[PDB]
Design a protein around this ligand. Structure first.
Ligand code: CEF
Length: 358
């Protein structure tokens, strides 16, 4: 690692870990296309098992980037269109409020106020239908962006229906394996249990629990090395040999809606580079990130702009993650931690590091 990398990383992350009391953390910085790795702390406190290159973390909502890209792949395959009504793939959703709600809306949180979370009481596919059939929008389709598991989650589950494959098998066969993410799982197999960090919420060790649309919204676990490879793949989709995966990646970074200075892709979110740091830092605070905001349609969507800051936050009960990258400058960062700590702290650190290297 060039000194400047070490310099910044240690200066920025160390106090961050101490400030946020983070038990374990892994950081990857992609600099002129190459990854550089840093780990701190314990994956398992009680076991005193260190974080390593092989430790799996719960990505939480960073999983949405996989879901957007898989969806992008399905479009490229000619299997769905984002202009398809949701009812085309779920005909049992017959209540009148669904008419005019398209896959684009679900994927980009503009269906009209689908809720932030699918309620814990929703378990069976029966509950799931009832939940969406009873939901009442707060706004008309395509007018407001309200960040929501239940929106992008539904998108993921429906996007895979023409393939006939489950969501997990589609993700594994169409995205993980081709990008050679061999330590990335929706369901961590036994041979990896020893590498799967615990999360910590107020001192208690926790792992995410089964939830409806969990795999689609928040259920990916991956290592720092596989997450660097995800970033490289999204920095440079042209190096990618699978035609439809290449195209799916590019579509996930198309700009479909603008709210303030951000643009909504499929999973990914984007801003023009150069970016005002206050804007992404402050925008990451849940009082803005979770608020409803008006959207302007970009008709037709703007193709992936290389001069972009492209990013996504995610968290579970016990974990906190952030990924950001700038395709023009071949620069990116991954931050995985096994405590959920405030979004703006992550984004601030990330900006300090990548600003210092740009
Ligand atoms: C994505 O990260 C997603 N987060 C979650 O669904 C969960 N927690 O967030 C704190 C979650 C899933 S299972 C479990 N026990 N907890 C969305 N992001 C946020 C966020 O913090 O950025 C949310 C507030 C909930 S929805």
């Amino acid at each position: 690692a060039p000194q400047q990398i070490n310099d910044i990383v240690h200066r920025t992350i160390t106090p961050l870990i101490e400030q946020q009391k983070i038990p374990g953390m892994a950081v990857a910085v992609i600099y002129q296309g190459k990854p550089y790795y840093f780990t701190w702390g314990y994956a398992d406190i009680a076991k005193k098992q260190p974080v390593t290159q092989q430790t799996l973390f719960e990505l939480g909502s960073v999983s949405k980037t996989f879901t957007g890209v898989l969806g992008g792949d399905a479009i490229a395959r000619g299997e769905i269109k984002l202009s398809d009504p949701t009812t085309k793939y779920w005909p049992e959703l017959t209540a009148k409020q669904w008419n005019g709600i398209t896959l684009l809306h679900l994927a980009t949180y503009t269906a009209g106020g689908l809720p932030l979370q699918v309620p814990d009481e929703v378990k069976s596919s029966s509950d799931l239908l009832r939940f969406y059939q009873n939901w009442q929008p707060a706004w008309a389709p395509g007018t407001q962006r309200l960040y929501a598991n239940s929106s992008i989650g539904l998108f993921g589950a429906l996007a895979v229906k023409p393939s006939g494959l489950s969501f997990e098998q589609a993700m594994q066969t169409r995205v993980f394996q081709p990008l050679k993410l061999n330590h990335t799982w929706i369901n961590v197999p036994p041979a990896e249990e020893k590498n799967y960090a615990w999360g910590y919420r107020e001192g208690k060790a926790v792992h995410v629990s089964p939830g409806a649309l969990d795999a689609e919204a928040y259920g990916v676990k991956s290592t720092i090395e596989d997450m660097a490879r995800w970033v490289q793949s999204n920095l440079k989709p042209l190096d990618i040999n699978e035609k439809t995966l290449q195209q799916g990646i590019q579509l996930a970074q198309s700009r479909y809606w603008q709210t303030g200075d951000m643009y909504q892709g499929l999973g990914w979110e984007m801003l023009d580079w150069p970016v005002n740091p206050d804007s992404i830092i402050n925008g990451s605070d849940n009082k803005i990130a979770l608020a409803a905001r008006p959207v302007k349609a970009i008709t037709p969507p703007t193709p992936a702009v290389r001069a972009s800051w492209v990013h996504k936050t995610g968290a579970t009960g016990g974990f906190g993650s952030y990924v950001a990258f700038i395709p023009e400058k071949e620069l990116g960062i991954v931050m995985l931690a096994n405590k959920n700590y405030p979004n703006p702290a992550r984004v601030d650190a990330a900006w300090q590091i990548l600003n210092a290297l740009q």
